[PDB]
Write a protein that binds this ligand. Sequence first.
Ligand SMILES: *[C@@H]1O[C@H](CO[C@H]2O[C@@H](C)[C@@H](O)[C@@H](O)[C@@H]2O)[C@@H](O[C@@H]2O[C@H](CO)[C@@H](O[C@@H]3O[C@H](CO[C@H]4O[C@H](CO)[C@@H](O)[C@H](O)[C@@H]4O[C@@H]4O[C@H](CO)[C@@H](O)[C@H](O)[C@H]4NC(C)=O)[C@@H](O)[C@H](O[C@H]4O[C@H](CO)[C@@H](O)[C@H](O)[C@@H]4O[C@@H]4O[C@H](CO)[C@@H](O)[C@H](O)[C@H]4NC(C)=O)[C@@H]3O)[C@H](O)[C@H]2NC(C)=O)[C@H](O)[C@H]1NC(C)=O
Ligand SMILES: *[C@@H]1O[C@H](CO[C@H]2O[C@@H](C)[C@@H](O)[C@@H](O)[C@@H]2O)[C@@H](O[C@@H]2O[C@H](CO)[C@@H](O[C@@H]3O[C@H](CO[C@H]4O[C@H](CO)[C@@H](O)[C@H](O)[C@@H]4O[C@@H]4O[C@H](CO)[C@@H](O)[C@H](O)[C@H]4NC(C)=O)[C@@H](O)[C@H](O[C@H]4O[C@H](CO)[C@@H](O)[C@H](O)[C@@H]4O[C@H]4O[C@H](CO)[C@@H](O)[C@H](O)[C@H]4NC(C)=O)[C@@H]3O)[C@H](O)[C@H]2NC(C)=O)[C@H](O)[C@H]1NC(C)=O
Lengths: 207, 206
Amino acid sequence: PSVFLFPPKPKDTLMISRTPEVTCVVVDVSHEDPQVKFNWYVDGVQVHNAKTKPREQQYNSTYRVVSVLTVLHQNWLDGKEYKCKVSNKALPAPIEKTISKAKGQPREPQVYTLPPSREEMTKNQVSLTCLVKGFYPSDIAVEWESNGQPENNYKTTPPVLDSDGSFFLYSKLTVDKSRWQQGNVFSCSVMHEALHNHYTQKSLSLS
Amino acid sequence: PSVFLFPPKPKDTLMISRTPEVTCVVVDVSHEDPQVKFNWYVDGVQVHNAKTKPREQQYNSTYRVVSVLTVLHQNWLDGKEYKCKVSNKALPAPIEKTISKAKGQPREPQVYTLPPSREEMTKNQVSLTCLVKGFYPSDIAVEWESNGQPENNYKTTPPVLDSDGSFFLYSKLTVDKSRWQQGNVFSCSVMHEALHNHYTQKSLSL
Ligand SMILES: *[C@@H]1O[C@H](CO[C@H]2O[C@@H](C)[C@@H](O)[C@@H](O)[C@@H]2O)[C@@H](O[C@@H]2O[C@H](CO)[C@@H](O[C@@H]3O[C@H](CO[C@H]4O[C@H](CO)[C@@H](O)[C@H](O)[C@@H]4O[C@@H]4O[C@H](CO)[C@@H](O)[C@H](O)[C@H]4NC(C)=O)[C@@H](O)[C@H](O[C@H]4O[C@H](CO)[C@@H](O)[C@H](O)[C@@H]4O[C@@H]4O[C@H](CO)[C@@H](O)[C@H](O)[C@H]4NC(C)=O)[C@@H]3O)[C@H](O)[C@H]2NC(C)=O)[C@H](O)[C@H]1NC(C)=O
Ligand SMILES: *[C@@H]1O[C@H](CO[C@H]2O[C@@H](C)[C@@H](O)[C@@H](O)[C@@H]2O)[C@@H](O[C@@H]2O[C@H](CO)[C@@H](O[C@@H]3O[C@H](CO[C@H]4O[C@H](CO)[C@@H](O)[C@H](O)[C@@H]4O[C@@H]4O[C@H](CO)[C@@H](O)[C@H](O)[C@H]4NC(C)=O)[C@@H](O)[C@H](O[C@H]4O[C@H](CO)[C@@H](O)[C@H](O)[C@@H]4O[C@H]4O[C@H](CO)[C@@H](O)[C@H](O)[C@H]4NC(C)=O)[C@@H]3O)[C@H](O)[C@H]2NC(C)=O)[C@H](O)[C@H]1NC(C)=O
């Protein structure tokens, strides 16, 4: 019986409208003893339930049980810890997993736009770069938009630990060289705990 | 037990100056169940001690008998399959792990250097950027230099899969806004299998 804890997505805890959740997954719950008991703790409190919500399923030759705990944006942002306790009769002792945002003071991310290299504008498509550095924790979200709509041909590198101990990454948007020249303006939106309304934005054009 | 094979460092297979090596790491070997044996096979051949060399342990309460094999840059680059065959008493059966380089037509990388952003010109330090895309496989080594001398304060994002099945990454050198003001010239070095002479170098400056 294995147990994996999953944290909410970066955007979920940054937007009051979204719904952030902590998910507890248990794989390899034998066919014989499919009983699984979940106990949830938020800073060690709640052996007595909470929102909670399990379901039940069947796979290869084992069982999979998922429990979902909705969390409060500020509880997560305030570093609270979430414990999932999985008890199974076919287990020597209960298995406990715990997760939260990384410990450390939140640093504001610096977002810069970077136009393509002269030596690339000789190809049908160029690269519009968006540098995001000095942020912490690593939880973060990046997106691109040219006009009132998303650009879907871009990639973001995963965050990287700088010498600072803060985090940095690069998102690369790929545009038809023809567009970038038509004077079009693009922008990457970065969402982080340390940004004003959990959001800043930077423009990039050909002027 | 628990075996894990590791491929050589990209930079090692691209320059004969260095020696590539397939490192076989076995964890959690018991005190009462030591005596760890090895066996390396390159494309089937070699069942008897090849040119290996393993030793050293001690951990959290376990072992870890790490074996090491010397690789031939050509052998690896051509895709020969390296097979580590561990054998232990406290192990139900003979575990195994193989590995060869990522298969597929290699693709030379494009290297572009970028100036720091106008907006970043407000800090006591700036960011010299190096973009690298269109390369396959992902094994790649990126370094920075200034008039012959090495740069230490730089970080490189790992290889990321782009839409076309090729990879790209970014390297970032942190330098004093002054050095960039003085007009110094920095260079981005890229080592890859598909580059002529396994090496290309791009420059940037004010
Ligand atoms: C019997 O069947 C079961 C189901 O199999 C399914 O597969 C298909 C092919 C078919 O066979 C059918 O049977 C089923 O459809 C098998 O269950 C599997 O069991 C293994 C355990 O051996 C699980 O492996 C773990 O996977 C997680 C990641 O899982 C996420 O992503 C998967 C896609 O890649 C996806 O399939 C998963 O469902 C899950 O998705 C997430 O789900 C949540 C909830 O819905 C969502 O909110 C997310 O959005 C969603 N994400 C995405 C993307 O979709 C992985 O994290 C685990 O790795 C960690 O742990 C390893 C130790 O075991 C360790 O080696 C790793 O390095 C890694 O370590 C972690 O490192 C991080 C930092 O990076 C630390 O923070 C962690 O602390 C640390 N972990 C710890 C605590 O050690 C691991 O690989 C597998 O997910 C599961 N399959 C599914 C699906 O449930 C079963 O194995 C099989 N055989 C038997 C009998 O076992
Ligand atoms: C007792 O201590 C031991 C060591 O623990 C450490 O932390 C504390 C406990 C300390 O007290 C101290 O003991 C020690 O510092 C524990 O052993 C540990 O066991 C785990 C699980 O087996 C190991 O994790 C695996 O790590 C692999 C990567 O190893 C490299 O990277 C790590 C960190 O990144 C580094 O520490 C290692 O040294 C190693 O680094 C490489 O070393 C080479 C030689 O030195 C060198 O040439 C390389 O350049 C260097 N590279 C780096 C990283 O720099 C992962 O590969 C493993 O993941 C695979 O396997 C798991 C299954 O276990 C999969 O779930 C996972 O997905 C992945 O493989 C799958 O997915 C890939 C991706 O798609 C796919 O290709 C595969 O086909 C697929 N197959 C598999 C296998 O599933 C693990 O994470 C851990 O490293 C090891 N400890 C160390 C540091 O060696 C004991 O557990 C502990 N107590 C116990 C329980 O006994």
